[PDB]
């Protein structure tokens, strides 16, 4: 019954960004992005496919989650980090990124799934709540 | 390159519940659920597959989103509702449900994708913020 087209529709219905990246040395390049990722980042699939997602950090590269992400990937572990990210138009947003390793039928190829949740509203709500409390 | 297994892994990596339901008269019965849905609801895939998701409402059935959901489905429109839902152990949670119609190669069969986001923390954060403001 269920087919690849239906799973594709499921992935494109996600409110969170969903991507797959493939390890290419020190890069992990996008090989799949869903519609939510395009909307969240302001980049179209064609203009960022086969790039490392670190472009979302812009010039804001002094972020502690980077080293933990690299280490988790190297050790084949999942990880989750809240990162400062920037859309194509430069607008800032808080990105709660969840990275999961993938088991494939080709172990020589190493893939990671990324889930991007825009947590900007939640961060601001926590900030006001701390300011009033 | 990309295959159904990888899309399956993507769907199972989602933090939000992702399901597909098929119209069966006045019911729309689950034909696919991901791991997040099982965790969010406390039900395993085998015990709720081919059931209508309205079981998540428990005995709390006087909910305004129901009529709007039925109308959107009947008209082939997407919809989004925040519902009071209940896990298998009875614990309550706020469920922001996004329903999307599906285009299939068999138009006689009518499918809907459901995305379930647990918004309980966000609702409580909005409540405290209104109480202090
Ligand atoms: C699947 C996947 C998705 C990623 N998504 C993002 C993202 O949305 N935003 C971001 O800033 N970094 C993201 N990254 C992390 C960067 O691609 C990169 O791994 C990170 O910045 C650490 O490596 P670096 O220090 O060499 O840049 C993602 C990584 C992977 C593997
Ligand atoms: C794909 C899909 C997912 C749904 N997920 C939920 C859910 O998580 N929680 C819920 O309370 N209702 C959910 N519903 C709605 C119920 O299945 C049902 O359509 C709703 O209660 C309105 O119909 P009724 O008034 O006959 O119950 C979902 C419906 C669809 C089509």
Question: Rounded to the nearest 10 degrees, what angle do helices A4-13 and B4-13 cross at?
Answer: 30
| A91 touches B at CB < 8 Å | no
Question: Rounded to the nearest 10 degrees, what angle do helices B120-132 and A120-132 cross at?
Answer: 40
From the list B4, B16, B117, the residue facing A7 with the nearest CB is: B4
Question: Resolution of this PDB entry, in A?
Answer: 1.9
**Closest ligand 2 atom, residue B67 Cα:** 25
Find the radius of gyration of the CA atoms of chain A: 16
CATH number of the structural domain spanning residue B34:
3.30.450.20
Say how far apart CA A2 and CA B105 lie, in whole Å.
12
Report CB contact under 8 Å: A5, B117: no
Whether B95 has a binding-site annotation, put simply, is: yes
From the list B16, B31, B32, the residue facing A16 with the nearest CB is: B16
* The pair of three-digit structure tokens given for residue A59, joined into one six-digit string: 């010039």
Range of the domain at B46: 4-132
Contacting B residues, span 31-50, partner chain A, CB-CB under 8 Å = 31-32
Whether B66 has a binding-site annotation, put simply, is: yes
Beta strands in A2-133 (DSSP E): 17-24, 27-33, 79-86, 92-101, 111-118
Number of compact structural domains in chain A: 1
């Amino acid at each position: 019954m269920i087919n690849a087209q239906l799973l594709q529709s499921m992935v494109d219905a996600s409110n969170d960004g969903i991507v797959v990246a493939e390890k290419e040395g020190d890069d992990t390049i996008l090989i799949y992005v869903n519609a939510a990722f395009e909307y969240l980042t302001g980049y179209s699939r064609d203009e960022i496919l086969y790039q490392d997602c670190r472009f979302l950090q812009g010039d804001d590269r002094d972020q502690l989650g980077r080293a933990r992400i690299r280490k988790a990937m190297a050790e084949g572990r999942p990880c989750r980090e809240v990162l400062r990210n920037y859309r194509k138009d430069g607008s800032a947003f808080w990105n709660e990124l969840s990275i999961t390793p993938v088991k494939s039928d080709f172990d020589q190829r190493t893939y990671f799934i990324g889930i991007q949740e825009d947590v900007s509203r939640q961060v601001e709500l926590e900030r006001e709540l701390a300011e009033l409390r």
